[PDB]
C-alpha cells in the first residue's frame, strides 16, 4: 500500500530513522514473511483477470 502525504506535514519533507511509513513497513513485512517461512512458502496472486482475461502484473517484491 502507498499512502499519499497530507501535503503540509514537515515529517514528509524531512524524514528520519524512526519515522512511520506504510511502504517500508510492508516491504519489511514481506522480508519477515520470507525469513519466517521454515519449510514451505506458498505465494499466490491474481495474474489473470476474470472479466476480459487481461494480463495482471504481480507486485514489485514478488
Amino acid at each position: 500500500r502507498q499512502l499519499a502525504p497530507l501535503g503540509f506535514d514537515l515529517m514528509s519533507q524531512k524524514p528520519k530513522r524512526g519515522d512511520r511509513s506504510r511502504r517500508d513497513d510492508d516491504r519489511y513485512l514481506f522480508l519477515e514473511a520470507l525469513i519466517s517461512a521454515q519449510q514451505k512458502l506458498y505465494i499466490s496472486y491474481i495474474g489473470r483477470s476474470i472479466q476480459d482475461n487481461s494480463e495482471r502484473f504481480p507486485s514489485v517484491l514478488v
Partner: protein, 271 residues
C-alpha cells in the same frame, strides 16, 4: 422428502452461510453436471457461480438472512452496471469468435478482422458543433442549416476516425462489407448515399455517384493486396465438431485426517 431437504438447506443457510448451501444444493441435485452436459448451459453455470459469489460477498456484510434476499431483489430491480456486477467470460479453453466494438478495440491486436456493417452511417440531427477559428463548442438551439452542416462535418470526421481505428487493427487479413446504402426513403432516385458514409468518401473520393459508379470506383483500386468479390448468400453445412474422447480422471482420497481434536478450551468448554 423435498420439504425436509429444503429445511436442511435452510439450516445450512442459517449456520454455514450462502456458498455452502448453494454448493450442497449443486452437489446433491447434481445440477452442475446437467448444465455442463446441456449444450449452452456453461454460460448459465458461470452466471450462477458469479451470482453466488456476489451473494456471498453481500451476505457476509449483512447480519439478517432476509436482508440478502431483499438486496438480491433490489439488485434485480436495479439494472445499473458496476465494475463487479458485469458478465464475465464463459470459457477460456475453447476458442470463440470475439465480437468487439470499435471503441473497445483500440490498442488491441487481432489476426483476422471482419467488418460487415462499416458502410452503415447515422445522420446527426442536433446542432452542436465547434467554431473553426476560436475552437470552442457552440450549441445552436435554433434549427439553422449551417450549424447542422457544421455538425455533420464533425460527425463525418468522427466516422472517418472510427473507420481508421477499425481498419488499423488487422494483422493478416481484413474484410469489408460495401453496399449501395441509401438513407433516403426514395427507392430509385438515381443517386445513392455512400458518399454520406465514411467508407464511400475514400472510394468515391467525396463525390456523389451511383451503384455502377461505386462498383467502378471499387474496381479502380485493385492491387495484389486489395481485391473485391460479390456477396453470395448460401449455406451448405453448419460446421464439423471433430470430437475426441475425453481423458480419464479420478479425484484423490484423503488417507489421514488433516488435524486432531486440537483446541484451546477453558473450564466452560468441558462443562
Amino acid at each position: 422428502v423435498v420439504v425436509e431437504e429444503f429445511d436442511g438447506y435452510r439450516q445450512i443457510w442459517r449456520k454455514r452461510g450462502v456458498m455452502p448451501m448453494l454448493r450442497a444444493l449443486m452437489s446433491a441435485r447434481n445440477i452442475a453436471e446437467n448444465l455442463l452436459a446441456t449444450a449452452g448451459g456453461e454460460r448459465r453455470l458461470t452466471d450462477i457461480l458469479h451470482i453466488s459469489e456476489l451473494l456471498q460477498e453481500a451476505g457476509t456484510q449483512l447480519e439478517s438472512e432476509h436482508a440478502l434476499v431483499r438486496w438480491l431483489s433490489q439488485h434485480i430491480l436495479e439494472p445499473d452496471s458496476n465494475a463487479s456486477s458485469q458478465q464475465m467470460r464463459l470459457e477460456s479453453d475453447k476458442h470463440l469468435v470475439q465480437i468487439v466494438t470499435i471503441h473497445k478495440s483500440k490498442g488491441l491486436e487481432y489476426p483476422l478482422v471482419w467488418l460487415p456493417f462499416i458502410t452503415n452511417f447515422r445522420v446527426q440531427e442536433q446542432a452542436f458543433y465547434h467554431d473553426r477559428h476560436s475552437f470552442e463548442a457552440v450549441l445552436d438551439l435554433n434549427a439553422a442549416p449551417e450549424s447542422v452542416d457544421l455538425a455533420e462535418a464533425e460527425r463525418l470526421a468522427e466516422d472517418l476516425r472510427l473507420l481508421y481505428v477499425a481498419l488499423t487493427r488487422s494483422v493478416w487479413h481484413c474484410s469489408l462489407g460495401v453496399a449501395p446504402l441509401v438513407r433516403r426513403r426514395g427507392d430509385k432516385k438515381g443517386d445513392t448515399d455512400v458518399h454520406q458514409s465514411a467508407l464511400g468518401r475514400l472510394l468515391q473520393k467525396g463525390e456523389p455517384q451511383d451503384a455502377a459508379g461505386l462498383r467502378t470506383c471499387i474496381e479502380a483500386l485493385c492491387d495484389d493486396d486489395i481485391a473485391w468479390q460479390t456477396a453470395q448468400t448460401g449455406d451448405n453445412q453448419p460446421w464439423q465438431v471433430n470430437d475426441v474422447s475425453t481423458a480419464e480422471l479420478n479425484a484423490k482420497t484423503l488417507q489421514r485426517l488433516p488435524g486432531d481434536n486440537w483446541r484451546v478450551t477453558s473450564y466452560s468448554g468441558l462443562q
